[PDB]
Amino acid sequence: HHMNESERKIVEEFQKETGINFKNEELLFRALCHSSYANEQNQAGRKDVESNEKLEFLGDAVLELFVCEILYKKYPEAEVGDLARVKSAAASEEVLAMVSRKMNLGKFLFLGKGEEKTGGRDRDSILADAFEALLAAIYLDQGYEKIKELFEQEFEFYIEKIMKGEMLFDYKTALQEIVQSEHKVPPEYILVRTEKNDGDRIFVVEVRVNGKTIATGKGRTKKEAEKEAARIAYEKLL
Amino acid sequence: HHMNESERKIVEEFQKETGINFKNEELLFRALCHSSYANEQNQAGRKDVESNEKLEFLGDAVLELFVCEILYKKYPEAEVGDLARVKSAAASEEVLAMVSRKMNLGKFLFLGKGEEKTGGRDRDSILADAFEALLAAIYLDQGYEKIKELFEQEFEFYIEKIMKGEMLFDYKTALQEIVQSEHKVPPEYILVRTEKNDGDRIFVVEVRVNGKTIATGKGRTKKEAEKEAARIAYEKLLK
């Protein structure tokens, strides 16, 4: 398949924006191609444009192994019934769409005009599916180690939340909504210090409202600590 | 977990017999331990004897990726629906038990006395589970490339049969039974030719009864051709 100008631009923007470069850019294009766009282009005579359905099929297996490996290695004392519970929760459409949105994945999808007109770019199923297809593309292009490099830290965090029975969602967005509603101002995040416990560098962030510290969260990155802080503040405020 | 004498001998034998040598033998031991054995040993004070249930949980995902990767790479034209159908069949208990039996896995399992007495060593589910657990052990000890090196060819063969809609089972044993019954002699497999056909070498095997050829089979190895010849002969002998 020969990428036309607008397709090449999108493919270039995706790599620049997400930082995920590809050796074979055709794998990336394919992962982002919803069937509605492949059908549209094929009907326009571009028979080599293909959907992400096959990559999604492989991607789901890549994801399952990636999540189960984290569970097996990180929770040796967990009952097998617990590994299975968490596995299902971690690989769910809900988590994947959340991950996709955080990556602004919707911006880079190729959709047929009708799908575009009817909200497909915001559809949880389409986003989750494209994310799985992306994992297969990265797996095929650069290997399983790259998948861990890009996503293990992020998923270890989601799996920890789920294993601990803590509800998982976009913490920062939820906290902002509740703080603006009750105080008419947004929450402020302050990195107050860093630590080096367990071997990893740890960021300590306090979330405050009107200068008052509501909660303190810790994480392996500034972003993660902010997320943790928002989770704690949200649960506390409620 | 310290391996006692009998556990040590089983582990050593497994490695010598299959040729799959482990850097970390505890992984191999755990894969071979059915819950009935672990529970029996724990109750007797050996608390570090663990079952293969966690390895099997990981092993199942290793198996799914292994089969899906083959399906994705080898059948680019297949509809996704065919890929999902073949995946389920390829990773099924039936196929996995067949594979386990080919590796004589049943002889290396650790089972509780009661479980062993009730026929556990021949139980399809126990065999399939330990094989998935073994895949996890090998994956953790030696890596994914070792899994392909050991099982890719074999699974590509099963996958091809299922993808073509051809029933999959122990062809040879099934043909043996039907030929022995009708003729009072067993079928014979004769490698009549080997050749390199734009890929690698391919063996041509003829299966015969009393010197008469019943069918011819081709494969990437002699054993594969023999299985193919038996499959063909068996289907034929339902004339």
Swiss-Prot record, chain B:
Superkingdom, taxonomy of origin: Bacteria
Entry GO CC: cytosol
Active site feature: D60, E132
pH profile of the protein: Optimum pH is 8.0.
Compartments where found: Cytoplasm
EC id: 3.1.26.3
Domain DRBM span(s) in chain numbering: 170-239
Keyword match Lipid metabolism: no
Cofactor: Mg(2+)
GO molecular function: double-stranded RNA binding; metal ion binding; ribonuclease III activity; rRNA binding
Subunit structure: Homodimer.
Record protein name field: Ribonuclease 3
Gene of this entry: rnc
